[PDB]
Amino acid sequence: HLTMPYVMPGDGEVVGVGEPVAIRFDENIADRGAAEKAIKITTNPPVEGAFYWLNNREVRWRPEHFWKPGTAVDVAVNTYGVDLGEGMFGEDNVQTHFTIGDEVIATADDNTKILTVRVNGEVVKSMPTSMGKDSTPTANGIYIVGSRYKHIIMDRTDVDWATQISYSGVFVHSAPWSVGAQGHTNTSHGCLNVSPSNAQWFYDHVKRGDIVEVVNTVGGTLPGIDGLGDWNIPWDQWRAGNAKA
Ligand SMILES: [Ca+2]
């Protein structure tokens, strides 16, 4: 009858301008309103933001637009002993403080099959890419950079320099097998294939909460409730929330 909250990002982290605050509970939350009320987010410079649930256990908070670099965020999850519905009570409080770093937005345009990395509005890197085949396309939309792996076995394929950008399993990563197609032809299951050198560059130069935007593919749009797809939910839907849904 107790539920523990877990907050991301980590205390003292510097994250990108797309990073939502995430409060994840280890049990389903029946009274989302109570949970939201128990979570106090302070921003400096102050910016309006709102809660939206990605699933029964995890709520996100973010502003209407990407964060401003330098913004400091304090999160107080004051859930200890709070009634969260159906006889479940918050086990404890948790807190985090984090800050926003540089604006890093990488745009993959299916028209050019180039991923262009912009840091604070400035092009710093361009890399040929091979995106999802027509039958398995990469969805368009805004993706948030999540975890990274120097090496990972995808699921069985060994992969180097893998930067995760969706929970659905889209990564930017080393793809030595499609170097010839990069910049020319889509060959993947959905991942953004780039050269070993470019994948290592990307891995080294991004951080959690940086943004990848995919445009002009034959896919649809990445689901807002993917896990890293938050920004695809239009603000008016996000702000309205789903506490009573
Ligand atoms: Ca109850």
Residue numbers in the entry: 150 to 304, 319 to 408
Publication excerpt:
Among five paralogues of l,d-transpeptidase in Mtb, two functional l,d-­transpeptidases, LdtMt1 (Rv0116c; 251 amino acids) and LdtMt2 (Rv2518c; MT2594; 408 amino acids), have been shown to generate 3→3 cross-links connecting two meso-diaminopimelic acid (meso-DAP) residues at the third position of the stem peptides in vitro. Here, we report the crystal structure of an N-terminally truncated Mtb LdtMt2 (LdtMt2Δ130) that encompasses residues Leu131–Ala408. In this structure, the catalytic l,d-transpeptidase domain (residues Asp251–Val378) is preceded by a bacterial immunoglobulin-like (Ig-like) Big_5 domain (residues His150–Gly250) and followed by an extended C-­terminal tail (residues Asn379–Ala408) that interacts with both domains.
We refined three models of LdtMt2Δ130: (i) the apo form, (ii) a mercury-derivatized ligand-free form and (iii) a meropenem-complexed form. The apo and mercury-derivatized crystals contained one monomer of LdtMt2Δ130 per asymmetric unit, whereas the crystals of the meropenem complex contained two monomers (chains A and B) in the asymmetric unit. In these models, the N-­terminal residues (Leu131–Ala149 in the apo form, Leu131–Thr145 in the mercury derivative and Leu131–Gln140 in the meropenem complex for both chains A and B) and C-terminal affinity tag (LEHHHHHH) are disordered. The flexible nature of the active-site lid is further supported by the apo structure, in which much of the lid is disordered. The r.m.s. deviation between the apo and mercury-derivative models is small (0.40 Å for 246 Cα-atom pairs), indicating that the mercury binding did not cause a large overall structural change. Such monomer–monomer contacts can be regarded as crystallization artifacts. The weighted r.m.s. errors for the monomer (1×) and dimer (2×) fits are 7.93 × 10−3 and 4.88 × 10−2, respectively, demonstrating the superiority of the 1× model. The residual plots shown in Supplementary Fig. S3(b) also support our conclusion that apo LdtMt2Δ130 exists as monomers in solution.
